[PDB]
Amino acid sequence: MAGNSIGQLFRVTTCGESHGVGLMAIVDGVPPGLALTEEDLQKDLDRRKPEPDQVEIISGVFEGKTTGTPIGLLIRNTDQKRSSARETAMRVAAGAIAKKYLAEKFGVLIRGHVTQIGNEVAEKLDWNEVPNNPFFCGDVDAVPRFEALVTSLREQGTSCGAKLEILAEKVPVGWGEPVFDRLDADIAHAMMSINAVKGVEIGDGFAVAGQFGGFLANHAGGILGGISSGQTIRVAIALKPTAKGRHDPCVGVRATPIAEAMLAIVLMDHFLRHRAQNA
Amino acid sequence: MAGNSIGQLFRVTTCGESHGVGLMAIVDGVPPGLALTEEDLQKDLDRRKPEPDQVEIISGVFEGKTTGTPIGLLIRNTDQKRSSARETAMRVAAGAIAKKYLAEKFGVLIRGHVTQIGNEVAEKLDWNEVPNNPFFCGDVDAVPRFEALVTSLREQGTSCGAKLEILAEKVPVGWGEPVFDRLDADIAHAMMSINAVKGVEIGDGFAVAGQFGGFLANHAGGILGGISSGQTIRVAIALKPTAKGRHDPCVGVRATPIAEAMLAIVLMDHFLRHRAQNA
């Protein structure tokens, strides 16, 4: 069955089987006055693969602007008279709304890149490189090596795991709600909704275990005592390997847009909670 | 300090400052008929230290048994007309309740051990050893090395990180609520309430990124598609270094009881949700 809702103030509630008639979300809490259209949501949906099933805004937008009421989303499944991009669509469409709002309001920029596929690691990050290749890889000299590895596993009936880093930049200080709703805790919660995820870490993450107590190197990954620092938010996740020519070697790279979406959803929620706690 | 509640059906709500008058919790959802007394809670409280302040049960127990009504817990702070074990007390007391219930009902066994302090790692696990030393260490040949490392770092005035593994055994299959309240997701959420945690992983965890695709080797750590497998639940967390003879080189080992508590709280919650969902 389902726990089909996430968030306290920015709340997303969903339903829909991948094989069922369609998929739906109700998104609460988005302030009035955000420019929004179907296109703004499709753009992020269509980033899962880099004419597919089209999202429709059913409510909450009048004359191209959010009204402040609950926003209803629908995808009608054109299953032609079990691909799990349909299981991820409402999350990504809803994250898109949170992204667009956080970008306009604060200039928050949320972006993910694959740092590792199996035994190949990316060693350096160039944000202009991540859309040029189909791995979301920021290291233009690792792309060939990732491609060779994918070519290699495709041949031999196997698949590999991955590790993604997601960053949220320009996030105001103060967001998060200790004891139980720390920003890191809700992040980890949200990331762990993505299917093959086996770990989440913030900042230096598991390395920390072997550390001893570098200037402003953001060891905390932008969260301290469960509340945003002001620094960039760094989150990493590890996705496990996944079970005609099915061209399936590393599905985990295609999780980048949804990990971006989940981080946006959590930040949007905590934005609103922080605001509610300040008037 | 607004997020003072956790759980949907097994719900724990807390309050209290460390130099306020006292600390409180209200714990909802525990069925009637569990044998329970202050002592059962103190035992777990006093495990934070491998004269002192005593938890009191205010409601929800009659003639030594839970009634099924909300259980109120109080600790009056005897400040003596400087320790942070106070902000962790209500979580551990309440986890103790979830623990006892899950042990009597299903024989569930939730235990944690420190696998790593800084540059020292434990190899072997012997549950009998873990209470014999003050590191919750399961390797009797590592205890000396952990003691040496810690003795040094206190005299040097340096702190080190740690890594804990928490296991939940004999957990029934079926528990957890995808999409957004998967068991692993609520585990991670809960573990990250513990201050100093920078990562949570389930099963093989971050190793998974470097893997390629008997089966009963818990690669998944007892959770598959966000729901319990029947296998042992394996969770690891990494705690960062902190910063008269009260210098805390690795305060992270003392997190073992609270990580046990948090895992108990989440399991208890998902037990009840699972029960509610079956008609």
Coordinates of C-alpha atoms in Angstrom, one line a residue:
Chain A
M1 CA 0.0 0.0 0.0
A2 CA 1.4 3.6 0.8
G3 CA 2.6 6.4 2.9
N4 CA 1.7 8.9 0.1
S5 CA 2.4 12.3 1.7
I6 CA 5.6 14.3 2.6
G7 CA 6.1 17.7 4.3
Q8 CA 4.4 19.7 7.1
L9 CA 3.9 23.1 5.3
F10 CA 5.1 22.4 1.8
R11 CA 3.2 19.1 1.5
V12 CA 3.0 16.8 -1.5
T13 CA 0.5 14.0 -1.5
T14 CA 0.4 11.5 -4.3
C15 CA -1.2 8.4 -5.8
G16 CA -1.1 6.4 -9.0
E17 CA 0.1 3.0 -10.2
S18 CA 2.6 2.9 -13.1
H19 CA 0.2 0.6 -14.9
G20 CA -3.0 2.4 -13.6
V21 CA -5.0 5.1 -15.5
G22 CA -2.8 8.0 -14.3
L23 CA -0.7 9.6 -11.6
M24 CA -1.7 12.5 -9.3
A25 CA -0.3 14.9 -6.8
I26 CA -1.7 17.5 -4.6
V27 CA 1.0 20.1 -3.6
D28 CA 0.1 22.5 -0.7
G29 CA 1.8 25.6 0.6
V30 CA 3.3 27.3 -2.4
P31 CA 2.8 31.0 -2.0
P32 CA 0.8 33.0 -4.5
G33 CA 2.6 34.9 -7.3
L34 CA 5.1 32.3 -8.7
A35 CA 5.0 32.2 -12.5
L36 CA 4.3 28.5 -13.3
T37 CA 3.2 26.4 -16.3
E38 CA 3.2 22.8 -17.4
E39 CA 6.5 23.5 -19.3
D40 CA 8.3 24.4 -16.1
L41 CA 7.5 20.9 -14.8
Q42 CA 8.0 18.9 -18.0
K43 CA 11.5 20.3 -18.4
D44 CA 12.5 18.6 -15.2
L45 CA 10.5 15.5 -16.0
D46 CA 12.1 15.1 -19.4
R47 CA 15.6 15.4 -17.7
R48 CA 15.2 11.8 -16.4
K49 CA 16.3 10.7 -19.8
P50 CA 19.1 12.7 -21.4
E51 CA 6.4 12.1 -27.1
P52 CA 6.5 11.2 -23.4
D53 CA 3.6 11.4 -21.0
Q54 CA 2.6 14.9 -20.3
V55 CA 1.9 16.5 -16.8
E56 CA -1.1 18.8 -16.5
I57 CA -1.8 21.4 -13.9
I58 CA -5.3 21.0 -12.8
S59 CA -5.6 23.6 -10.1
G60 CA -3.7 26.4 -8.2
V61 CA -2.7 28.5 -11.1
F62 CA -4.6 31.4 -12.4
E63 CA -3.4 33.5 -15.4
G64 CA 0.1 31.9 -15.3
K65 CA 0.6 32.6 -11.5
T66 CA 0.2 30.4 -8.4
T67 CA -3.0 31.4 -6.5
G68 CA -1.8 30.1 -3.2
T69 CA -4.3 27.3 -3.3
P70 CA -3.5 23.6 -3.5
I71 CA -1.9 22.7 -6.8
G72 CA -3.2 19.6 -8.5
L73 CA -1.0 17.6 -10.9
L74 CA -2.1 14.9 -13.3
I75 CA -0.4 12.6 -15.6
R76 CA -2.6 10.4 -17.8
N77 CA -0.7 7.2 -18.6
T78 CA -0.6 6.5 -22.3
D79 CA 0.3 2.8 -21.7
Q80 CA -0.4 2.0 -25.4
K81 CA -3.6 0.0 -26.0
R82 CA 6.5 -1.7 -16.0
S83 CA 9.0 1.3 -16.5
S84 CA 9.6 3.0 -13.1
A85 CA 10.0 6.5 -14.5
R86 CA 6.2 6.8 -13.8
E87 CA 6.8 6.0 -10.1
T88 CA 9.1 9.0 -9.9
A89 CA 7.2 11.6 -11.9
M90 CA 5.1 13.3 -9.3
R91 CA 8.0 13.8 -7.0
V92 CA 10.0 15.5 -9.8
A93 CA 7.1 17.6 -11.0
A94 CA 6.6 18.8 -7.4
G95 CA 10.3 19.4 -6.8
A96 CA 10.3 21.6 -9.9
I97 CA 7.8 23.8 -8.2
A98 CA 9.9 24.0 -5.1
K99 CA 13.1 24.6 -7.2
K100 CA 11.6 27.4 -9.2
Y101 CA 10.3 29.2 -6.1
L102 CA 13.6 28.8 -4.2
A103 CA 15.6 30.1 -7.2
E104 CA 13.5 33.2 -7.7
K105 CA 13.2 34.0 -4.0
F106 CA 16.7 33.3 -2.8
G107 CA 18.8 32.3 -5.8
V108 CA 19.0 28.8 -4.5
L109 CA 20.5 26.5 -7.0
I110 CA 20.1 22.8 -6.5
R111 CA 22.2 20.5 -8.7
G112 CA 23.5 16.9 -8.6
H113 CA 26.3 15.0 -10.4
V114 CA 27.4 11.4 -10.5
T115 CA 30.8 11.1 -8.8
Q116 CA 31.1 7.3 -9.3
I117 CA 29.9 4.5 -11.4
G118 CA 31.2 1.1 -10.1
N119 CA 35.0 1.3 -10.1
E120 CA 35.3 4.5 -12.2
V121 CA 35.4 7.8 -10.2
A122 CA 35.0 11.4 -11.4
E123 CA 37.9 13.5 -9.9
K124 CA 36.8 17.1 -10.6
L125 CA 33.6 19.1 -11.1
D126 CA 32.7 21.4 -14.0
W127 CA 29.0 22.3 -14.0
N128 CA 29.0 23.1 -17.7
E129 CA 30.1 19.5 -18.4
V130 CA 27.3 17.7 -16.5
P131 CA 24.6 18.3 -19.3
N132 CA 27.0 17.5 -22.2
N133 CA 27.1 13.8 -21.3
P134 CA 24.5 11.2 -20.4
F135 CA 26.0 10.3 -16.9
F136 CA 25.5 13.8 -15.3
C137 CA 29.4 13.7 -14.9
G138 CA 31.3 16.9 -14.1
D139 CA 34.7 15.4 -15.1
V140 CA 34.9 15.6 -18.9
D141 CA 37.9 13.2 -18.9
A142 CA 36.0 10.6 -16.8
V143 CA 33.0 10.6 -19.3
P144 CA 35.0 8.3 -21.7
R145 CA 35.9 6.0 -18.8
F146 CA 32.3 5.9 -17.6
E147 CA 31.1 5.3 -21.2
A148 CA 33.7 2.4 -21.6
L149 CA 32.5 0.8 -18.3
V150 CA 28.8 1.1 -19.4
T151 CA 29.7 -0.3 -22.8
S152 CA 31.6 -3.1 -20.9
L153 CA 28.8 -4.2 -18.6
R154 CA 26.1 -3.9 -21.3
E155 CA 28.0 -6.6 -23.2
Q156 CA 28.1 -9.1 -20.3
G157 CA 24.7 -9.1 -18.6
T158 CA 25.6 -7.0 -15.6
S159 CA 25.0 -3.7 -13.8
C160 CA 26.8 -1.4 -11.4
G161 CA 26.1 0.9 -8.5
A162 CA 26.6 4.6 -8.3
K163 CA 27.2 7.6 -6.0
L164 CA 25.7 10.9 -6.5
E165 CA 26.5 14.3 -4.9
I166 CA 23.7 16.9 -4.7
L167 CA 24.5 20.4 -3.8
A168 CA 22.2 23.2 -2.7
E169 CA 23.8 26.7 -3.0
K170 CA 22.8 30.1 -1.7
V171 CA 20.6 28.5 1.0
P172 CA 19.9 31.0 3.8
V173 CA 21.2 30.2 7.3
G174 CA 18.6 29.1 10.0
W175 CA 16.5 26.4 8.3
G176 CA 15.7 23.1 10.1
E177 CA 13.9 21.9 13.2
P178 CA 15.7 20.0 15.9
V179 CA 15.2 17.7 17.8
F180 CA 13.5 15.4 15.3
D181 CA 13.1 17.5 12.2
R182 CA 16.6 18.7 11.6
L183 CA 17.3 19.7 8.1
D184 CA 19.8 16.8 7.6
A185 CA 17.3 14.3 9.1
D186 CA 14.6 15.4 6.7
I187 CA 17.1 15.4 3.8
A188 CA 18.1 11.8 4.6
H189 CA 14.5 10.8 4.9
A190 CA 13.6 12.3 1.5
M191 CA 16.7 10.9 -0.3
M192 CA 16.0 7.5 1.0
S193 CA 12.6 7.5 -0.9
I194 CA 14.6 6.9 -4.0
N195 CA 14.6 3.2 -4.7
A196 CA 18.1 1.8 -4.9
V197 CA 19.6 4.2 -2.2
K198 CA 21.6 2.4 0.5
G199 CA 23.2 5.4 2.3
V200 CA 23.0 9.2 2.7
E201 CA 25.7 11.4 4.0
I202 CA 26.1 15.1 4.6
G203 CA 29.3 17.0 4.2
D204 CA 32.4 14.8 4.7
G205 CA 30.0 12.1 5.6
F206 CA 31.3 8.7 6.4
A207 CA 35.0 10.0 6.2
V208 CA 34.2 11.7 9.4
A209 CA 34.5 8.3 11.2
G210 CA 38.3 8.4 10.6
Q211 CA 38.9 12.1 11.2
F212 CA 40.4 13.9 14.2
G213 CA 39.3 17.3 15.5
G214 CA 41.6 23.4 6.1
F215 CA 39.9 26.8 6.4
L216 CA 36.3 27.0 5.2
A217 CA 36.2 23.6 3.7
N218 CA 32.6 22.9 4.6
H219 CA 33.2 19.7 6.5
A220 CA 29.6 20.0 7.8
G221 CA 28.2 20.2 4.3
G222 CA 26.2 23.3 5.1
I223 CA 24.3 22.0 8.2
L224 CA 25.3 22.4 11.8
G225 CA 23.4 21.1 14.8
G226 CA 20.7 20.3 12.2
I227 CA 20.2 23.9 10.9
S228 CA 21.5 25.5 7.6
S229 CA 24.9 27.3 7.9
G230 CA 24.8 29.6 5.0
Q231 CA 27.3 27.4 3.1
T232 CA 26.6 25.2 0.3
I233 CA 24.6 22.1 1.2
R234 CA 26.4 18.9 0.3
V235 CA 24.6 15.6 0.3
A236 CA 25.8 12.3 -1.1
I237 CA 23.8 9.1 -1.8
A238 CA 24.8 5.6 -2.9
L239 CA 22.6 3.7 -5.3
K240 CA 22.9 -0.1 -5.5
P241 CA 23.1 -2.2 -8.7
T242 CA 19.8 -2.9 -10.4
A243 CA 18.2 -6.0 -12.1
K244 CA 15.7 -8.0 -26.8
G245 CA 18.6 -5.7 -25.8
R246 CA 17.6 -4.1 -22.5
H247 CA 20.1 -1.3 -22.2
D248 CA 20.3 -1.3 -18.4
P249 CA 23.8 -1.0 -16.9
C250 CA 23.6 2.0 -14.5
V251 CA 20.1 3.2 -13.9
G252 CA 21.5 5.1 -10.8
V253 CA 22.7 8.0 -12.9
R254 CA 19.0 8.7 -13.9
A255 CA 18.4 9.3 -10.2
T256 CA 20.1 12.7 -10.3
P257 CA 17.0 14.7 -11.2
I258 CA 14.9 13.0 -8.4
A259 CA 17.6 13.6 -5.8
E260 CA 17.6 17.2 -6.9
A261 CA 13.8 17.2 -6.6
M262 CA 13.8 15.6 -3.1
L263 CA 16.3 18.1 -1.8
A264 CA 14.1 21.0 -3.2
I265 CA 11.0 19.6 -1.5
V266 CA 12.7 19.4 1.9
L267 CA 14.2 22.9 1.6
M268 CA 10.9 24.4 0.5
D269 CA 9.2 22.8 3.4
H270 CA 11.9 24.2 5.9
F271 CA 11.8 27.6 4.3
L272 CA 8.1 27.9 5.1
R273 CA 8.6 26.5 8.6
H274 CA 11.4 29.0 9.3
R275 CA 9.2 31.8 8.0
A276 CA 6.2 30.6 10.2
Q277 CA 8.5 30.8 13.2
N278 CA 9.6 34.5 12.5
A279 CA 6.6 36.8 12.3
Chain B
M1 CA 13.2 24.1 19.2
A2 CA 10.2 23.2 17.3
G3 CA 10.3 19.9 16.1
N4 CA 9.5 18.1 19.3
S5 CA 7.5 15.1 18.0
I6 CA 8.3 11.9 16.1
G7 CA 6.1 9.1 14.8
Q8 CA 2.5 8.7 13.5
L9 CA 1.0 5.9 15.7
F10 CA 3.9 5.4 18.1
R11 CA 4.4 9.0 18.8
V12 CA 6.8 10.7 21.1
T13 CA 6.4 14.3 22.0
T14 CA 9.0 16.1 24.1
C15 CA 10.0 19.3 25.8
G16 CA 12.5 20.6 28.3
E17 CA 15.7 22.6 28.3
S18 CA 18.9 21.2 29.9
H19 CA 18.9 24.0 32.6
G20 CA 15.1 24.3 32.7
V21 CA 13.1 22.8 35.5
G22 CA 12.7 19.4 33.9
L23 CA 12.3 17.3 30.9
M24 CA 9.1 15.6 29.6
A25 CA 7.8 13.3 27.1
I26 CA 4.3 12.1 26.1
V27 CA 4.4 8.7 24.4
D28 CA 1.3 7.6 22.5
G29 CA 0.3 4.3 21.0
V30 CA 1.8 1.6 23.2
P31 CA -0.8 -1.1 23.5
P32 CA -2.1 -2.2 26.9
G33 CA -0.5 -5.1 28.9
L34 CA 3.2 -4.4 28.7
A35 CA 5.0 -4.8 32.0
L36 CA 6.7 -1.5 32.6
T37 CA 8.2 0.4 35.4
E38 CA 10.6 3.3 36.1
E39 CA 13.4 0.8 36.4
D40 CA 13.0 -0.5 32.9
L41 CA 13.6 3.0 31.6
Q42 CA 16.4 3.9 34.0
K43 CA 18.4 0.9 33.0
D44 CA 18.6 2.3 29.4
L45 CA 19.1 5.9 30.6
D46 CA 22.0 4.8 32.9
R47 CA 23.6 2.9 29.9
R48 CA 24.7 6.3 28.5
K49 CA 27.6 6.0 31.0
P50 CA 29.2 2.6 30.7
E51 CA 23.0 10.6 41.5
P52 CA 21.8 10.4 39.0
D53 CA 18.5 12.1 37.9
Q54 CA 15.5 9.8 37.9
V55 CA 12.7 9.4 35.3
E56 CA 9.2 9.2 36.7
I57 CA 6.2 7.6 35.0
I58 CA 3.3 10.0 35.4
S59 CA 0.5 8.2 33.4
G60 CA -0.4 5.2 31.3
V61 CA 0.5 2.4 33.7
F62 CA -1.7 0.6 36.2
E63 CA -0.4 -2.0 38.7
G64 CA 2.8 -2.4 36.6
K65 CA 1.2 -2.6 33.2
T66 CA 0.5 -0.2 30.3
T67 CA -3.1 0.8 30.1
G68 CA -3.1 1.8 26.5
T69 CA -3.4 5.5 27.4
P70 CA -0.7 8.2 26.8
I71 CA 2.3 7.6 28.9
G72 CA 3.8 10.7 30.5
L73 CA 7.5 10.8 31.5
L74 CA 9.2 13.4 33.7
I75 CA 12.7 14.0 34.7
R76 CA 13.1 16.8 37.3
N77 CA 16.5 18.4 36.8
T78 CA 18.5 18.4 40.0
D79 CA 20.9 21.0 38.7
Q80 CA 22.3 21.3 42.2
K81 CA 20.5 24.6 43.1
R82 CA 27.8 20.4 33.0
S83 CA 26.3 17.7 30.9
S84 CA 24.3 17.4 27.7
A85 CA 22.9 13.8 28.5
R86 CA 19.7 15.7 29.4
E87 CA 18.7 16.5 25.8
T88 CA 19.0 12.8 25.0
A89 CA 17.1 11.4 28.0
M90 CA 13.5 11.4 26.8
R91 CA 14.4 9.7 23.5
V92 CA 16.2 6.9 25.4
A93 CA 13.5 6.4 28.0
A94 CA 10.9 6.2 25.2
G95 CA 13.0 3.9 23.1
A96 CA 13.2 1.7 26.1
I97 CA 9.4 1.3 26.0
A98 CA 9.4 0.4 22.3
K99 CA 12.3 -2.0 22.9
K100 CA 10.7 -3.9 25.7
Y101 CA 7.5 -4.2 23.7
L102 CA 9.2 -5.4 20.5
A103 CA 11.2 -7.9 22.6
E104 CA 8.2 -9.4 24.3
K105 CA 5.9 -9.4 21.3
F106 CA 8.3 -10.6 18.5
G107 CA 11.6 -11.3 20.3
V108 CA 13.1 -8.4 18.4
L109 CA 16.7 -7.7 19.6
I110 CA 18.1 -4.2 18.9
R111 CA 21.8 -3.8 19.8
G112 CA 24.6 -1.4 18.6
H113 CA 28.3 -1.6 18.7
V114 CA 31.2 0.7 17.9
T115 CA 33.1 -0.6 14.9
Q116 CA 35.6 2.3 14.6
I117 CA 37.1 5.1 16.6
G118 CA 39.4 7.4 14.5
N119 CA 42.2 5.1 13.0
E120 CA 41.4 2.1 15.1
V121 CA 38.8 -0.5 13.7
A122 CA 37.1 -3.5 15.4
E123 CA 37.2 -6.7 13.3
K124 CA 35.1 -9.3 15.1
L125 CA 31.7 -9.1 16.9
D126 CA 31.1 -10.9 20.2
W127 CA 27.9 -9.6 21.8
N128 CA 29.2 -10.7 25.2
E129 CA 32.1 -8.4 25.0
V130 CA 30.2 -5.2 24.2
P131 CA 29.2 -4.5 27.9
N132 CA 32.7 -5.6 29.2
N133 CA 34.4 -2.4 28.0
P134 CA 33.4 1.2 28.0
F135 CA 33.4 1.5 24.1
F136 CA 30.5 -0.8 23.3
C137 CA 33.2 -2.7 21.3
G138 CA 32.5 -6.3 20.2
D139 CA 36.2 -7.1 19.5
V140 CA 38.1 -7.9 22.7
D141 CA 41.5 -7.5 20.9
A142 CA 40.4 -4.0 19.7
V143 CA 39.5 -2.7 23.2
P144 CA 43.2 -2.2 24.2
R145 CA 43.8 -0.3 20.9
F146 CA 40.6 1.8 21.4
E147 CA 41.8 2.5 25.1
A148 CA 45.3 3.4 23.9
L149 CA 44.0 5.8 21.2
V150 CA 41.5 7.5 23.5
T151 CA 44.0 7.8 26.4
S152 CA 46.4 9.6 23.9
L153 CA 43.8 11.9 22.4
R154 CA 42.6 13.1 25.8
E155 CA 46.2 14.0 26.8
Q156 CA 46.8 15.6 23.4
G157 CA 43.4 17.4 23.6
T158 CA 42.2 16.0 20.3
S159 CA 38.8 14.4 19.4
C160 CA 38.1 11.6 17.0
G161 CA 35.1 10.5 15.0
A162 CA 33.3 7.1 15.3
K163 CA 31.3 4.6 13.4
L164 CA 28.5 2.6 15.0
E165 CA 26.6 -0.4 13.6
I166 CA 23.1 -1.0 15.0
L167 CA 21.3 -4.3 14.4
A168 CA 17.7 -5.2 14.8
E169 CA 17.1 -9.0 14.7
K170 CA 13.9 -11.0 14.3
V171 CA 12.0 -8.1 12.8
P172 CA 8.9 -9.4 11.0
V173 CA 8.6 -9.0 7.2
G174 CA 6.2 -6.3 5.9
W175 CA 7.0 -3.1 7.9
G176 CA 7.5 0.3 6.2
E177 CA 5.5 2.6 4.1
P178 CA 6.7 3.6 0.6
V179 CA 6.7 6.1 -1.1
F180 CA 7.8 8.6 1.5
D181 CA 7.7 6.6 4.8
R182 CA 9.8 3.6 3.8
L183 CA 11.4 2.0 6.8
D184 CA 14.9 2.8 5.8
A185 CA 13.8 6.5 5.2
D186 CA 12.3 6.7 8.7
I187 CA 15.4 5.0 10.1
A188 CA 17.7 7.5 8.5
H189 CA 15.6 10.4 9.6
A190 CA 15.6 9.1 13.2
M191 CA 19.4 8.4 13.3
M192 CA 20.1 11.9 12.1
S193 CA 18.4 13.4 15.2
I194 CA 21.6 12.3 17.0
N195 CA 24.0 15.1 17.1
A196 CA 27.2 14.5 15.3
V197 CA 25.9 12.0 12.8
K198 CA 27.1 12.8 9.2
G199 CA 25.9 9.6 7.5
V200 CA 23.5 6.8 7.7
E201 CA 23.7 3.6 5.7
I202 CA 21.6 0.5 5.4
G203 CA 23.2 -2.9 4.7
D204 CA 26.3 -2.7 2.6
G205 CA 25.6 1.0 2.5
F206 CA 28.2 3.2 0.7
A207 CA 30.1 0.0 -0.5
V208 CA 27.2 -0.4 -2.9
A209 CA 28.4 2.4 -5.3
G210 CA 31.5 0.4 -6.1
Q211 CA 29.6 -3.0 -6.5
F212 CA 28.5 -4.9 -9.6
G213 CA 25.5 -7.3 -10.1
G214 CA 23.7 -17.1 -1.0
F215 CA 21.2 -14.2 -1.6
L216 CA 20.8 -14.4 2.1
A217 CA 23.8 -12.3 2.7
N218 CA 22.2 -9.1 3.9
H219 CA 23.4 -6.9 1.2
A220 CA 20.2 -5.0 1.7
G221 CA 20.6 -4.9 5.5
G222 CA 17.0 -6.3 6.1
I223 CA 15.1 -3.8 4.0
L224 CA 13.9 -4.2 0.4
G225 CA 11.9 -1.6 -1.5
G226 CA 11.6 0.2 1.7
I227 CA 9.9 -2.7 3.6
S228 CA 11.4 -5.2 6.1
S229 CA 12.7 -8.5 4.6
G230 CA 12.6 -10.7 7.6
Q231 CA 16.5 -10.6 7.8
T232 CA 18.5 -8.7 10.4
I233 CA 18.3 -5.0 10.0
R234 CA 21.8 -3.5 9.7
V235 CA 22.3 0.2 10.1
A236 CA 25.5 2.1 10.3
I237 CA 26.1 5.7 11.3
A238 CA 29.2 7.9 11.3
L239 CA 29.7 10.5 14.1
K240 CA 32.1 13.4 13.6
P241 CA 34.7 14.6 16.1
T242 CA 33.6 17.2 18.7
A243 CA 35.4 20.2 20.3
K244 CA 38.4 18.9 35.6
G245 CA 38.9 15.5 33.9
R246 CA 35.9 15.9 31.6
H247 CA 37.4 16.0 28.1
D248 CA 35.5 14.0 25.6
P249 CA 37.8 12.5 22.9
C250 CA 35.1 10.3 21.4
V251 CA 31.7 11.2 22.8
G252 CA 30.4 9.2 19.8
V253 CA 30.6 5.8 21.6
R254 CA 28.1 7.1 24.1
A255 CA 25.6 7.5 21.2
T256 CA 25.2 3.7 21.0
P257 CA 22.2 3.6 23.4
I258 CA 20.5 6.5 21.7
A259 CA 20.9 4.9 18.2
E260 CA 19.4 1.7 19.7
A261 CA 16.6 3.9 21.0
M262 CA 15.9 5.6 17.7
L263 CA 15.8 2.3 15.8
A264 CA 13.3 1.0 18.4
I265 CA 11.1 4.0 18.1
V266 CA 10.9 3.7 14.3
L267 CA 10.2 0.0 14.4
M268 CA 7.6 0.4 17.0
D269 CA 5.9 3.0 14.9
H270 CA 6.0 0.8 11.8
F271 CA 4.7 -2.2 13.7
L272 CA 1.5 -0.3 14.6
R273 CA 1.1 1.2 11.1
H274 CA 1.5 -2.3 9.7
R275 CA -1.1 -3.6 12.1
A276 CA -3.5 -0.8 11.3
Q277 CA -3.2 -1.4 7.5
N278 CA -4.2 -5.1 7.6
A279 CA -7.9 -5.7 7.6

